[PDB]
């Protein structure tokens, strides 16, 4: 688990490309509630496997939101995993 | 909640448009594991608000998968709800 960039006691949960930062949910709230400009920053949940990279693909069959590398590694393990249909995740808010 | 169309003891959890049927998870597995043709059917989870309609839009802020009617009713209540970004939900498998 990659730690939060703006505090000490928590592991990250979200990633913001605009700030190039990995934040726990509390720090996400503290940072992007300050004003409207920050509130317009698009953020994405962290990968649920490695928890070190922004999530990029949602697989409902796996019930998992994974980053690019983890998506490729999970769905190259065998022909059953390959058949899984994944949907790209988009940053929001 | 809407009952499962193929059994009497469970509430539905998914909707299959190809079968025009609301199904619980047990009956979903029973119906679509019958053969390679039925296994291709794409199914979607049931709306989390009304629990009677197929989910059409995912809202991460509300942490909710809603049908079109529930989506509009939730996100037209006030200008704060209107700001929520929702993504279309795609049936899978
Ligand atoms: Zn933090
Ligand atoms: Zn930011
Ligand atoms: Zn990952
Ligand atoms: Zn998968
Ligand atoms: Zn059933
Ligand atoms: Zn079906
Ligand atoms: Zn509904
Ligand atoms: Zn919402």
Swiss-Prot record, chains A, B:
Coiled-coil residue spans: none
Chain residues that bind Zn(2+) 1: 4, 7, 27, 32
Stated consequence of mutating residue 43 to H: In co-2; late-flowering under long day condition
Subcellular location field: Nucleus
Superkingdom as given in the UniProt entry: Eukaryota
Zn finger residue spans: B box-type: 1-41, 42-92
Tissue: Expressed in leaves, shoots and shoot apical meristem. Detected in the vascular tissue of the hypocotyl, the cotyledons and the leaves. Restricted to the protoxylem and phloem in young inflorescence stems and to the phloem only in older inflorescences. Also detected in the vascular tissue of the root.
Binding site for Zn(2+) 2: 47, 50, 70, 75
Free-text function comment from the UniProt entry: Transcription factor that acts in the long day flowering pathway and may mediate between the circadian clock and the control of flowering. Plays a role in the regulation of flowering time by acting on 'SUPPRESSOR OF OVEREXPRESSION OF CO1', 'TERMINAL FLOWER 1' and 'FLOWERING LOCUS T'. Also regulates P5CS2 and ACS10 (involved in proline and ethylene biosynthesis, respectively). Regulates the expression of NAKR1 by binding to the 5'-TGTG(N2-3)ATG-3' motif.
Domain note: The CCT domain is essential for the interaction with SPA1.
Additional facts recorded: The GIGANTEA-CONSTANS-FLOWER LOCUS T (GI-CO-FT) pathway to control photoperiodic flowering under LD is conserved between Arabidopsis and rice, but the regulation of the downstream gene by the upstream regulatory gene is reversed in the two species. In Arabidopsis, GI acts as an activator of CO, which in turn activates the floral activator FT under LD conditions. In rice, GI activates HD1/CO in a similar manner to that in Arabidopsis. However, under LD conditions, HD1 suppresses HD3A/FT expression, causing the suppression of flowering.
Quaternary organization: Interacts with ADO3, SPA1, SPA2, SPA3 and SPA4. Interacts with MRG1 and MRG2 (via MRG domain). Interacts (via B-box) with MIP1A. Interacts with AS1 to form a functional complex regulating FT expression. Interacts with NFYC9. Component of a red light-dependent nuclear complex made of PHL, PHYB and CO. Interacts directly with PHL in the presence of PHYB.
Sequence similarity: Belongs to the CONSTANS family.
Protein name: Zinc finger protein CONSTANS
Upper lineage: Eukaryota, Viridiplantae, Streptophyta, Embryophyta, Tracheophyta
Gene behind this protein: CO
Residue window of the full protein shown: 17 to 109 of 373
């Amino acid at each position: 688990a990659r730690p939060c960039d703006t505090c000490r006691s928590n592991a990250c949960t979200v990633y913001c490309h605009a700030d190039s930062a990995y934040l726990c949910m509390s720090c996400d709230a503290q940072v992007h509630s300050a004003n409207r400009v920050a509130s317009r920053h698009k953020r994405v949940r962290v990968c649920e496997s490695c928890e070190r990279a922004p999530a990029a693909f949602l697989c409902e069959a796996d019930d998992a939101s994974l980053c690019t590398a983890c998506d490729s590694e999970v769905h190259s393990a065998n022909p059953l995993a390959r058949r899984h249909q994944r949907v790209p995740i988009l940053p929001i808010s």
